[PDB]
Amino acid sequence: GSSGSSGLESEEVDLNAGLHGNWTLENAKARLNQYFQKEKIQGEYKYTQVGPDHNRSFIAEMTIYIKQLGRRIFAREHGSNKKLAAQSCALSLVRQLYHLGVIEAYSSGPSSG
């Protein structure tokens, strides 16, 4: 494994990308951890393995309470592995946070190139 020492963007972004939200499978997993660091909240994914051990997939689920709204949000999703499952779960919390107005559309530009 490896990574860069800094990140930058100098590219343009569409106006409709602020209406659909730039939250992706990985940028949502980051944004849910950012929400937990800013609010002093903690959350861990509940997993369930499905299928036979020679050909399996994983379900992942999470539920969190929002003290700034007075309610909670829940998700349950699945991938071919725990990473894909938790990625799909995170995007399902983050797109409910965006729908309820706890967050806005992400600043990262189009994935088309």
The experimental technique behind this entry is NMR
CATH number of the domain within which 53 lies: 3.30.160.20
Q: CA-to-CA distance for 78 and 85, rounded, in angstroms? A: 4
Q: Contact 28/103 with Cβ under 8 angstroms?
A: no
- Residue 89 corresponds to which tokens in the numbers above? 């779960």
- Using CA atoms, how far residue 107 sits from 5, 14, 62, 70, in Å, is 20, 11, 25, 27
Phi-psi domain of 6 (left: phi exceeds 0; alpha: psi -120 through 50; beta: other): beta
Query: Which amino acid does the sequence have at 13?
Result: V
Query: What residues contact 3, with CB distance under 8 A and at least 6 apart?
Result: none
